[PDB]
């Protein structure tokens, strides 16, 4: 009754805002910033100018590993105590290094591709692109330890990654380093001496994590280097600040109570929705305010399920706390945290859109909603044509400039570039030096057509219906 629902929606808004206030804690951006600056910005060598973000060859990777990586991992021991044996390393005198970092690689098999018979004399070795069906599963080199022997995915407790080029599996040839620099450096030097990264390697992962006992917040660090079949090196990274020891302070108890209240609110909403649908209005879908309700309920249920799943499955931390000289496997937790963050973000976005149902109090706000509702159909009808022409331009750009410009290398990238052109955020250079003909022609025709015709058509469509609605309301008011 326009008041029973308004109050319980403002209460829902308050609960949701409280939930996201503690979820997005302060002094967390600086933590990730410091880690990123330490690892991805330190030059690989004093005489070198390259860092992890600009790796260019397999020889640069070896310089980075036994180099700027060990400097940031194994910090000084701050000697003021007995230092009985192999004292632990605090990365910033505050960040504890949990367990020990792990390195691993994924490679392919020599007899993978099929070179043509025409020139089968000057071509002796070949390795296809990475795939599960074309993976090496045999000992190579000095088949001595675990760095030269395949170990299945189930034995590493790993999972896929979905990198830049392909989706890499969880198996491969791995090695767990040591807790001190003087031993990890020796292990890496031994790996480099007798070649470990051959021409058949396709990917390399380095993983570790930190605690930072000051503010209780774990952080998992993963660095990936991809070696495509065509040569080169592609780096990628992720730093996920996840939390596992929630209930330590009273504010966490408050957040738990807020989560319980949120669950009760969601239960009440789903019960009232099903009660409405069971008897009243068996069609129920021609309002645009009920699809939003079911979307919100579904997203909230998914978020609650994900949260329960990733909160009950925290036995990895318990296993790690038994033996602290082993690699802590905290990748699934980070993946599920990312998924939960995305779901929470979209739900929070849709609630504020739901808020629109109640801003209709005065007459001057009724005509705007009436105009929007009346013009939505025509706006969709013209947006269909707008998107068709936009996609035609995008596919033309992808087929023409998609191999040289690095801004049209993918269909998604073409779409993003064409949206950025509307912003006036384009350089006009790589297009013209890519092709002096059909280069500027495409740009000029796109700008002219899109901007003038379609933007003015949208303006005309909105303006005509707004004027019509205003005139109709004025005539009705003056005639009554």
């Amino acid at each position: 009754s326009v008041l029973r629902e308004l109050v319980t929606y403002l209460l829902f808004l308050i609960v949701l805002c409280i939930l996201t206030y503690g979820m997005m804690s302060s002094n967390v951006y600086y933590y990730t910033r410091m880690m990123s600056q330490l690892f991805l910005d330190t030059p690989v060598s004093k005489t070198e100018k390259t860092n992890f973000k600009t790796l260019s060859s397999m020889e640069d990777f070896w310089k980075f590993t036994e180099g700027s990586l060990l400097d940031g991992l194994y910090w000084k021991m701050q000697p003021s105590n007995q230092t009985e044996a192999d004292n632990r390393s605090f990365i910033f005198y505050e960040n504890l290094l949990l367990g020990v970092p792990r390195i691993r690689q994924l490679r392919v098999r020599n007899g993978s591709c099929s070179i043509p018979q025409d020139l089968r004399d000057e071509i002796k070795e070949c390795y296809d692109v990475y795939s599960v069906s074309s993976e090496d599963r045999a000992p190579f080199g000095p088949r001595n330890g675990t760095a030269w022997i395949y170990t299945s995915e189930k034995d590493l407790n790993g999972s896929s990654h979905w990198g830049i080029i392909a989706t890499y599996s969880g198996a491969g040839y791995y090695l767990d380093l040591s807790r001190t620099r003087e031993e990890t450096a020796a292990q890496v030097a031994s790996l480099k001496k007798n070649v470990w990264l051959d021409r058949g390697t396709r990917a390399t992962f380095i993983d570790f994590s930190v605690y930072n006992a000051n503010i209780n917040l774990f952080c998992v660090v993963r660095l990936l280097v991809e070696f495509p079949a065509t040569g080169g090196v592609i780096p990628s990274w992720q730093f996920q600040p996840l939390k596992l020891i929630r209930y330590v302070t009273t504010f966490d108890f408050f957040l738990a109570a807020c989560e319980i209240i949120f669950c009760f609110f969601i239960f009440y909403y789903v019960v009232e929705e099903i009660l409405e649908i069971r008897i009243h209005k068996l069609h129920y879908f021609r309002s645009f305010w009920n699809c939003l309700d079911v979307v919100i309920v579904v997203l909230s249920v998914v978020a609650i399920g994900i949260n329960i799943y990733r909160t009950s499955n925290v036995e990895v931390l318990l296993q790690f706390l038994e033996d602290q000289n082993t690699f802590p496997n905290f990748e699934h937790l980070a993946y599920w945290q990312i998924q939960f963050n995305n779901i929470a973000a979209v739900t929070v976005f849709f609630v504020w859109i739901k808020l629109f149902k109640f801003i209709n109090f005065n007459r001057t706000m009724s005509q705007l909603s009436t105009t929007m509702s009346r013009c939505a159909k025509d706006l969709f009808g013209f947006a269909i044509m707008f998107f068709i022409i936009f996609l035609a331009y995008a596919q033309l750009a992808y087929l023409v400039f998609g191999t040289q410009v690095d801004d049209f290398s993918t269909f998604q990238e073409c779409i993003f570039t064409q949206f950025r052109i509307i912003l006036g955020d384009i350089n006009f250079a790589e297009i013209e030096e890519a092709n002096r003909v059909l280069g500027p022609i495409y740009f000029t025709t796109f700008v002219f057509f899109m901007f003038f015709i379609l933007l003015n058509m949208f303006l005309a469509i909105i303006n005509d219906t707004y004027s019509e609605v205003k005139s109709d309301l004025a005539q009705q008011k003056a005639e009554m």
């Binding site: 795939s131 599960v132 069906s133 989706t167």
Partner: peptide
């Protein structure tokens, strides 16, 4: 004689385009 073959990960655009065209023509017809 069914095999359940090709555990490989690849995409063949010819078949997908042919099927998409054959469905779109029906949808517009």
């Amino acid at each position: 004689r069914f095999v359940f073959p090709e555990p490989t990960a690849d995409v063949n655009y010819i078949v997908m385009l042919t099927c998409a065209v054959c469905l779109v023509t029906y949808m517009v017809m």
